[PDB]
Amino acid sequence: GPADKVVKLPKPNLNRTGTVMKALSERQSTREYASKALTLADLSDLLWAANGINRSDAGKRTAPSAMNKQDVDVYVILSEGSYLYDAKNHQLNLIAEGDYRGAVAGGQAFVKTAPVSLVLISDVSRFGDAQKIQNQLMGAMDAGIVSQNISIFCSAAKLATVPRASMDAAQLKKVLKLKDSQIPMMNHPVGYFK
Protein backbone atom coordinates (compact mmCIF):
# COMPACT_ATOMS: atom_id res chain seq x y z
CA GLY A 1 0.00 0.00 0.00
CA PRO A 2 1.10 3.69 0.18
CA ALA A 3 4.25 4.55 2.21
CA ASP A 4 3.74 6.72 5.34
CA LYS A 5 5.91 9.39 3.67
CA VAL A 6 6.58 10.19 0.00
CA VAL A 7 9.10 12.70 -1.37
CA LYS A 8 8.15 13.75 -4.90
CA LEU A 9 11.27 14.85 -6.73
CA PRO A 10 11.40 17.68 -9.34
CA LYS A 11 11.94 16.87 -13.01
CA PRO A 12 15.69 16.18 -13.54
CA ASN A 13 17.56 19.28 -14.80
CA LEU A 14 18.96 18.15 -18.17
CA ASN A 15 20.41 21.68 -18.71
CA ARG A 16 23.21 21.42 -16.05
CA THR A 17 26.58 22.52 -17.56
CA GLY A 18 29.27 19.94 -16.55
CA THR A 19 30.76 18.06 -19.50
CA VAL A 20 31.62 14.36 -19.47
CA MET A 21 35.30 14.91 -20.16
CA LYS A 22 35.63 17.44 -17.28
CA ALA A 23 33.60 15.21 -14.95
CA LEU A 24 35.97 12.27 -15.73
CA SER A 25 38.99 14.59 -15.23
CA GLU A 26 37.77 15.55 -11.73
CA ARG A 27 36.27 12.12 -10.77
CA GLN A 28 37.72 11.24 -7.32
CA SER A 29 36.85 9.73 -3.90
CA THR A 30 36.21 12.23 -1.15
CA ARG A 31 35.72 11.16 2.45
CA GLU A 32 34.68 14.47 4.13
CA TYR A 33 31.42 16.36 3.61
CA ALA A 34 29.69 19.56 4.58
CA SER A 35 27.00 18.92 7.21
CA LYS A 36 24.36 20.69 5.01
CA ALA A 37 21.48 18.70 3.45
CA LEU A 38 21.44 18.32 -0.32
CA THR A 39 18.94 20.59 -1.99
CA LEU A 40 15.98 18.76 -3.50
CA ALA A 41 17.19 19.63 -7.02
CA ASP A 42 20.63 18.05 -6.31
CA LEU A 43 19.10 14.95 -4.72
CA SER A 44 16.64 14.58 -7.61
CA ASP A 45 19.30 14.91 -10.27
CA LEU A 46 21.59 12.52 -8.32
CA LEU A 47 18.97 9.74 -8.13
CA TRP A 48 17.88 10.17 -11.77
CA ALA A 49 21.53 10.02 -12.77
CA ALA A 50 22.08 6.90 -10.69
CA ASN A 51 19.25 4.81 -12.12
CA GLY A 52 16.48 7.05 -13.41
CA ILE A 53 14.14 6.26 -16.35
CA ASN A 54 15.65 7.91 -19.45
CA ARG A 55 13.24 6.25 -22.00
CA SER A 56 9.70 6.49 -20.75
CA ASP A 57 8.19 4.49 -23.67
CA ALA A 58 10.37 1.41 -22.87
CA GLY A 59 10.84 1.96 -19.13
CA LYS A 60 14.58 1.79 -19.63
CA ARG A 61 17.16 3.40 -17.39
CA THR A 62 20.31 5.58 -17.19
CA ALA A 63 22.09 2.41 -15.97
CA PRO A 64 22.13 -0.71 -18.17
CA SER A 65 21.44 -4.06 -16.49
CA ALA A 66 21.95 -7.69 -17.39
CA MET A 67 18.89 -8.95 -19.35
CA ASN A 68 17.25 -5.53 -18.65
CA LYS A 69 16.27 -6.94 -15.22
CA GLN A 70 16.93 -3.54 -13.57
CA ASP A 71 18.07 -5.28 -10.40
CA VAL A 72 19.76 -2.40 -8.58
CA ASP A 73 17.46 -0.61 -6.18
CA VAL A 74 18.76 2.62 -4.71
CA TYR A 75 17.99 3.07 -1.07
CA VAL A 76 18.43 6.60 0.24
CA ILE A 77 19.53 6.95 3.87
CA LEU A 78 18.81 10.39 5.33
CA SER A 79 18.93 11.59 8.93
CA GLU A 80 15.11 11.58 9.16
CA GLY A 81 14.45 8.19 7.52
CA SER A 82 15.46 5.63 4.91
CA TYR A 83 13.69 5.61 1.58
CA LEU A 84 13.52 3.63 -1.64
CA TYR A 85 13.90 5.46 -4.96
CA ASP A 86 10.93 4.64 -7.20
CA ALA A 87 12.19 5.41 -10.69
CA LYS A 88 8.77 5.00 -12.36
CA ASN A 89 7.29 7.91 -10.41
CA HIS A 90 10.66 9.64 -9.73
CA GLN A 91 9.94 9.74 -6.00
CA LEU A 92 11.18 8.48 -2.59
CA ASN A 93 8.96 6.06 -0.68
CA LEU A 94 9.68 5.76 3.08
CA ILE A 95 11.02 2.34 4.19
CA ALA A 96 11.90 3.08 7.82
CA GLU A 97 11.85 6.14 10.07
CA GLY A 98 15.12 6.86 11.87
CA ASP A 99 18.78 7.67 11.12
CA TYR A 100 20.54 4.55 9.84
CA ARG A 101 23.68 6.26 8.54
CA GLY A 102 25.57 4.27 11.23
CA ALA A 103 24.61 0.96 9.52
CA VAL A 104 26.12 2.20 6.27
CA ALA A 105 29.35 3.33 7.92
CA GLY A 106 30.22 -0.17 9.12
CA GLY A 107 33.28 1.04 11.04
CA GLN A 108 34.31 4.04 8.92
CA ALA A 109 33.08 6.98 10.98
CA PHE A 110 33.42 9.63 8.22
CA VAL A 111 30.36 8.03 6.57
CA LYS A 112 28.14 9.21 9.44
CA THR A 113 29.00 12.83 8.51
CA ALA A 114 27.49 12.67 5.01
CA PRO A 115 23.95 14.09 4.79
CA VAL A 116 22.90 11.25 2.53
CA SER A 117 24.08 7.78 1.74
CA LEU A 118 22.87 5.80 -1.29
CA VAL A 119 22.90 2.03 -0.80
CA LEU A 120 22.92 -0.02 -4.03
CA ILE A 121 21.01 -3.19 -3.31
CA SER A 122 20.81 -5.80 -6.05
CA ASP A 123 17.60 -7.83 -6.02
CA VAL A 124 19.41 -10.85 -7.33
CA SER A 125 16.08 -12.83 -7.47
CA ARG A 126 15.30 -10.74 -10.62
CA PHE A 127 17.80 -13.03 -12.40
CA GLY A 128 16.37 -16.25 -10.95
CA ASP A 129 17.96 -18.08 -8.02
CA ALA A 130 19.55 -15.51 -5.70
CA GLN A 131 21.83 -18.36 -4.45
CA LYS A 132 23.68 -18.83 -7.77
CA ILE A 133 27.04 -17.04 -7.88
CA GLN A 134 26.70 -16.07 -11.61
CA ASN A 135 23.53 -14.18 -10.54
CA GLN A 136 25.44 -12.52 -7.67
CA LEU A 137 28.26 -11.56 -10.09
CA MET A 138 25.81 -9.89 -12.50
CA GLY A 139 24.35 -8.03 -9.52
CA ALA A 140 27.86 -6.83 -8.62
CA MET A 141 28.52 -5.63 -12.19
CA ASP A 142 25.15 -3.89 -12.24
CA ALA A 143 25.95 -2.20 -8.90
CA GLY A 144 29.31 -1.00 -10.25
CA ILE A 145 27.49 0.54 -13.17
CA VAL A 146 25.10 2.49 -10.97
CA SER A 147 28.05 3.48 -8.70
CA GLN A 148 29.85 5.09 -11.59
CA ASN A 149 26.74 7.02 -12.72
CA ILE A 150 26.80 8.44 -9.16
CA SER A 151 30.51 9.24 -9.23
CA ILE A 152 30.32 10.93 -12.66
CA PHE A 153 27.24 12.97 -11.73
CA CYS A 154 28.91 14.00 -8.44
CA SER A 155 32.00 15.18 -10.36
CA ALA A 156 29.88 17.27 -12.77
CA ALA A 157 27.68 18.66 -10.01
CA LYS A 158 30.63 19.34 -7.62
CA LEU A 159 29.41 16.91 -4.94
CA ALA A 160 31.73 14.81 -2.75
CA THR A 161 31.27 11.02 -2.83
CA VAL A 162 33.23 7.80 -2.44
CA PRO A 163 32.16 4.35 -3.71
CA ARG A 164 32.23 1.81 -0.88
CA ALA A 165 31.83 -1.92 -0.40
CA SER A 166 32.19 -1.74 3.43
CA MET A 167 28.97 -1.50 5.44
CA ASP A 168 27.09 -3.39 8.16
CA ALA A 169 25.06 -5.51 5.75
CA ALA A 170 23.32 -7.51 8.51
CA GLN A 171 22.08 -4.34 10.19
CA LEU A 172 20.97 -2.86 6.82
CA LYS A 173 19.02 -6.06 6.07
CA LYS A 174 17.05 -5.56 9.30
CA VAL A 175 16.56 -1.81 9.31
CA LEU A 176 15.68 -1.53 5.58
CA LYS A 177 13.50 -4.68 5.82
CA LEU A 178 15.33 -6.40 2.97
CA LYS A 179 14.56 -9.86 1.72
CA ASP A 180 17.56 -12.16 1.67
CA SER A 181 17.48 -12.06 -2.12
CA GLN A 182 18.22 -8.30 -1.90
CA ILE A 183 22.01 -8.10 -1.48
CA PRO A 184 23.68 -4.79 -0.53
CA MET A 185 26.57 -4.48 -2.95
CA MET A 186 27.91 -0.87 -2.59
CA ASN A 187 27.14 2.44 -0.94
CA HIS A 188 27.91 6.09 -1.69
CA PRO A 189 28.01 8.70 1.02
CA VAL A 190 27.25 11.99 -0.79
CA GLY A 191 27.42 15.59 0.29
CA TYR A 192 28.65 19.04 -0.67
CA PHE A 193 32.43 19.48 -0.42
CA LYS A 194 33.36 20.62 3.05
Ligand X SMILES: Cc1cc2nc3c(=O)[nH]c(=O)nc-3n(C[C@H](O)[C@H](O)[C@H](O)COP(=O)(O)O)c2cc1C
For ligand X, give the closer residue by CB, 89 or 166: 166
The verdict on whether residue 164 carries a ligand-binding annotation is no
Please give the residues from 1 up to 30 whose contact with ligand X meets the rule CB under 6 A: 28-29
- The rounded radius of gyration (Å) of the Cα atoms in the chain is 16
Q: Give yes or no for residue 159 binding a second copy (CB under 8 A).
A: no
Burial 20-38 (b: 16+ CB within 10 A, else e): eeebeeeeeebeebeeeeb
The verdict on whether residue 126 carries a ligand-binding annotation is no
> Which of 138, 167, 172, 175 forms a contact with a second copy (CB under 8 A)?
138
Residue 36 gets which letter from DSSP? S
Q: Give yes or no for residue 142 binding ligand X (CB under 6 A).
A: yes
Q: Give yes or no for residue 61 binding ligand X (CB under 6 A).
A: yes
| Among 85, 70, 155, CA closest to 119 | 85
User: What is the closest distance, in whole angstroms, from the C-beta atom of residue 121 to ligand X in the complex?
Assistant: 15
Binding footprint of a second copy on the chain (CB under 8 A): 12-29, 45, 48-49, 52, 54-55, 60, 62-64, 66, 133, 136-138, 140-149, 151-153, 155-157, 162-163, 165, 185-186
